[PDB]
Amino acid sequence: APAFSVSPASGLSDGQSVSVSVSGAAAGETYYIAQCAPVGGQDACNPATATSFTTDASGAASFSFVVRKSYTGSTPEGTPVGSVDCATAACNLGAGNSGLDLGHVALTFG
Protein backbone atom coordinates (compact mmCIF):
# COMPACT_ATOMS: atom_id res chain seq x y z
CA ALA A 1 0.00 0.00 0.00
CA PRO A 2 2.67 2.49 1.07
CA ALA A 3 5.82 3.24 -0.97
CA PHE A 4 9.46 2.75 0.08
CA SER A 5 12.16 2.63 -2.62
CA VAL A 6 15.72 3.85 -3.22
CA SER A 7 17.16 5.24 -6.49
CA PRO A 8 20.53 3.40 -6.30
CA ALA A 9 19.44 -0.14 -5.29
CA SER A 10 22.62 -1.81 -6.60
CA GLY A 11 26.30 -1.12 -7.29
CA LEU A 12 26.59 0.71 -3.94
CA SER A 13 30.09 1.58 -2.69
CA ASP A 14 31.26 2.23 0.90
CA GLY A 15 30.43 5.89 1.58
CA GLN A 16 28.31 6.27 -1.58
CA SER A 17 24.97 7.95 -0.75
CA VAL A 18 21.51 6.68 -1.75
CA SER A 19 18.21 8.47 -2.40
CA VAL A 20 15.25 7.19 -0.36
CA SER A 21 11.60 8.10 -0.88
CA VAL A 22 8.56 7.20 1.26
CA SER A 23 5.17 8.10 -0.28
CA GLY A 24 2.04 6.17 0.70
CA ALA A 25 1.40 6.33 4.47
CA ALA A 26 0.07 9.63 5.89
CA ALA A 27 0.31 12.08 8.81
CA GLY A 28 -0.32 10.16 12.05
CA GLU A 29 2.33 7.40 11.81
CA THR A 30 6.07 7.34 12.65
CA TYR A 31 8.71 5.09 11.05
CA TYR A 32 12.29 3.91 11.67
CA ILE A 33 14.64 3.63 8.65
CA ALA A 34 17.79 1.56 9.29
CA GLN A 35 20.11 -0.96 7.58
CA CYS A 36 21.03 -4.30 9.19
CA ALA A 37 22.88 -7.50 8.22
CA PRO A 38 23.49 -10.87 9.88
CA VAL A 39 26.99 -11.80 11.06
CA GLY A 40 28.92 -15.09 11.35
CA GLY A 41 27.82 -14.91 15.00
CA GLN A 42 24.16 -13.87 14.95
CA ASP A 43 22.95 -10.42 13.76
CA ALA A 44 24.16 -6.79 13.79
CA CYS A 45 22.68 -3.35 12.99
CA ASN A 46 24.21 0.06 12.15
CA PRO A 47 23.82 2.62 14.94
CA ALA A 48 25.20 5.65 13.03
CA THR A 49 22.73 5.20 10.14
CA ALA A 50 19.96 4.61 12.70
CA THR A 51 17.45 7.42 12.04
CA SER A 52 13.67 7.87 12.19
CA PHE A 53 11.09 10.04 10.39
CA THR A 54 7.33 10.74 10.36
CA THR A 55 4.71 11.05 7.56
CA ASP A 56 2.49 14.09 6.90
CA ALA A 57 1.87 15.44 3.37
CA SER A 58 -0.18 12.52 2.22
CA GLY A 59 2.45 10.48 4.08
CA ALA A 60 5.54 11.63 2.15
CA ALA A 61 9.15 11.39 3.35
CA SER A 62 11.97 11.74 0.79
CA PHE A 63 15.53 12.38 2.08
CA SER A 64 19.23 11.67 1.41
CA PHE A 65 20.66 8.56 3.11
CA VAL A 66 24.01 6.68 2.84
CA VAL A 67 25.43 3.13 2.84
CA ARG A 68 28.70 1.40 3.84
CA LYS A 69 30.09 -1.91 2.50
CA SER A 70 31.22 -2.70 6.05
CA TYR A 71 29.75 -0.94 9.11
CA THR A 72 30.62 -1.36 12.80
CA GLY A 73 27.65 -3.50 13.89
CA SER A 74 26.93 -5.13 17.27
CA THR A 75 24.77 -7.98 18.61
CA PRO A 76 21.62 -7.05 20.52
CA GLU A 77 22.68 -9.42 23.33
CA GLY A 78 25.44 -7.33 24.96
CA THR A 79 27.81 -9.12 22.55
CA PRO A 80 29.55 -6.65 20.26
CA VAL A 81 30.87 -9.14 17.66
CA GLY A 82 32.67 -6.31 15.86
CA SER A 83 32.38 -4.82 12.36
CA VAL A 84 30.01 -6.24 9.71
CA ASP A 85 30.50 -6.46 5.94
CA CYS A 86 28.24 -6.97 2.90
CA ALA A 87 30.75 -8.85 0.70
CA THR A 88 30.13 -12.39 2.02
CA ALA A 89 26.68 -11.53 3.43
CA ALA A 90 23.80 -9.37 2.13
CA CYS A 91 22.42 -6.12 3.59
CA ASN A 92 18.74 -5.17 3.80
CA LEU A 93 17.53 -1.59 4.39
CA GLY A 94 14.00 -1.58 5.84
CA ALA A 95 11.89 1.20 7.37
CA GLY A 96 8.57 0.91 9.24
CA ASN A 97 6.96 0.33 12.66
CA SER A 98 5.53 -2.73 14.46
CA GLY A 99 2.01 -1.56 13.48
CA LEU A 100 2.69 -0.69 9.82
CA ASP A 101 5.31 -2.41 7.63
CA LEU A 102 6.35 -0.34 4.58
CA GLY A 103 9.02 -2.71 3.24
CA HIS A 104 12.78 -2.97 2.64
CA VAL A 105 15.14 -2.83 -0.38
CA ALA A 106 17.83 -5.52 -0.77
CA LEU A 107 21.12 -3.66 -1.33
CA THR A 108 23.76 -5.24 -3.60
CA PHE A 109 27.50 -4.64 -4.09
CA GLY A 110 28.74 -5.26 -7.65
The CA distance from 34 to 28, in Å, is: 20
18 CB contacts (<8 Å, ≥6 apart)? 6, 7, 8, 12, 64, 65, 66, 67, 93
Asked whether the beta carbons of 59 and 24 are under 8 A apart, the reply is yes
Q: What are the φ/ψ torsions at residue 7 (nearest 5 degrees)? A: -45, -75
**Does residue 39 contact residue 89 with C-beta atoms inside 8 Å?**
yes
Method of determination used here? NMR
CATH topology of domain 1-110: Immunoglobulin-like (2.60.40)
Separation in Å, CA 50 to CA 32, 95, 106: 8, 10, 17
The CA distances from residue 51 to 30, 48, 88, 93, 109, in Å, are 11, 8, 26, 12, 23
- Which letter does DSSP use for residue 48 in this model? T
Distance of alpha carbon 69 from alpha carbon 91, whole angstroms: 9
